[PDB]
């Protein structure tokens, strides 16, 4: 419950740091938030926000472990699970640089496990840099507008559109809709046209990604219709 219980190993990004718990040596991360400039109105919005995050237990959602206070630093520490595979943005960037497309089995895993993550988020009522990989091929959802759906521009189905954009980009190594301006971008999104994902990928994968990118939210598949898809098999699910 105190910072003294953990030892910082190193900075991941800037603050995000990799840490080891002294009691058992568990590898975790935490996030540094300086609330030394927040109002009592912001710290109230911050406290409740975190306590909802505490409530989300699911194998495909990044797991929360602890929150720590240090009045002397005015620093809030949010302690979470470490995903050693990194984020998906980096996987995508890695693929452009080395001119190598991702396996369809990888894409099916992401599709399957992010859909179960969304299904859990919808019961309690999305971009490559917010999706993490652990050490066992599991996919975990954590936490210029390429993925903005037409409706959220003019709804659970809005998340299906974002999922659709994410999977497309894993396949094509670029988003479905690109532009140099916002109006140009919004132009292309509303027209709903894009290249087929590369031919190395099956017609069946292309079909479901294209369905998620439908202009009509009511034409996009639901979480349940996605998991019914013959492409999706037990081995694409999470495993301890
Ligand atoms: C802001 C910087 N990052 C933020 C958070 C983060 N990263 C990891 N793992 C991990 C990351 C990179 C290389 C290798 C591993 N795990 C996390 N778990 C929660 N947040 C995490 C992503 C670039
Ligand atoms: Cl898991």
Summarize the helices and strands and which ones pair or pack.
Blueprint: E1 6-13, E2 16-21, E3 27-34, H1 40-53, E4 64-70, E5 75-81, E6 86-87, H2 88-97, H3 104-123, E7 131-133, E8 139-141, H4 156-172, H5 182-191, H6 203-212, H7 223-227
Antiparallel strand pairs: 1-2, 2-3, 3-5, 4-5, 6-7, 7-8
Helix pairs in contact: 3-4, 4-6
Bound molecules: ligand 7GG and chloride ion.
The ligand CCN(/C=C\c1nc(Nc2ccccc2)nc2nc[nH]c12)CC binds next to strand 1, strand 5 and strand 6.
Task: Provide a short characterization of the protein structure.
The chain is α+β, with helices and mostly antiparallel strands.
Structure description:
The chain is α+β, with helices and mostly antiparallel strands. The protein folds into 2 domains: 1-39 and 63-83, Phosphorylase Kinase, domain 1; 40-62 and 84-240, Transferase(Phosphotransferase) domain 1 (Transferase(Phosphotransferase), domain 1). Helix content is 36%, strand content 18%. It has 7 helices and 8 strands. The longest helix is centred in the middle third of the chain and has 20 residues, at 104-123. The protein is globular and about 55 Å long. The two termini are 27 Å apart. Residues 12-13, 16, 29, 62, 80-84, 86-87, 132, 142 line the site of the ligand CCN(/C=C\c1nc(Nc2ccccc2)nc2nc[nH]c12)CC. Its cofactor is Mg(2+). It catalyses: L-seryl-[protein] + ATP = O-phospho-L-seryl-[protein] + ADP + H(+); L-threonyl-[protein] + ATP = O-phospho-L-threonyl-[protein] + ADP + H(+). One of its GO terms (cellular component) is cytosol. GO terms for molecular function: ATP binding; metal ion binding; protein kinase activity; protein phosphatase binding; protein serine kinase activity; protein serine/threonine kinase activity.
């Amino acid at each position: 419950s105190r910072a003294e219980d953990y030892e910082v190993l190193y900075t991941i990004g800037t603050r995000c740091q990799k840490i080891r718990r002294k009691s058992d040596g568990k590898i975790l991360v935490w996030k540094e938030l300086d609330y030394g400039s927040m109002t009592e109105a912001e710290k109230q919005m911050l406290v409740s926000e975190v306590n909802l995050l505490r409530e989300l237990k699911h194998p495909n959602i990044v797991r929360y472990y602890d929150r720590i206070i240090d009045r002397t630093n005015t620093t809030l520490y949010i302690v979470m699970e470490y995903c050693e595979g990194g984020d998906l943005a980096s996987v995508i960037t890695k693929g452009t640089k080395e001119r190598q497309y991702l396996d369809e089995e990888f894409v099916l895993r992401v599709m399957t496990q992010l859909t179960l993550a969304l299904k859990e988020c919808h019961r309690r009522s999305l971009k490559p840099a917010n999706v993490f990989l652990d050490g066992k091929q599991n996919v975990k959802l954590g936490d210029t507008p390429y993925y903005m759906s037409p409706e959220q521009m003019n709804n659970e189905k809005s998340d299906i559109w974002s999922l659709g954009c994410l999977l497309y980009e894993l396949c094509a190594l670029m988003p479905p809709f690109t532009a140099f301006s916002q109006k140009e971008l919004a132009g292309k999104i509303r027209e709903g046209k894009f290249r087929r994902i590369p031919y190395r990928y099956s017609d069946e994968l292309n079909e479901i990604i294209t369905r998620m990118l439908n202009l009509k939210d009511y034409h996009r598949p639901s979480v349940e219709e996605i998991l019914e898809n013959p492409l999706i098999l037990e081995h694409h699910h999470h495993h301890h």
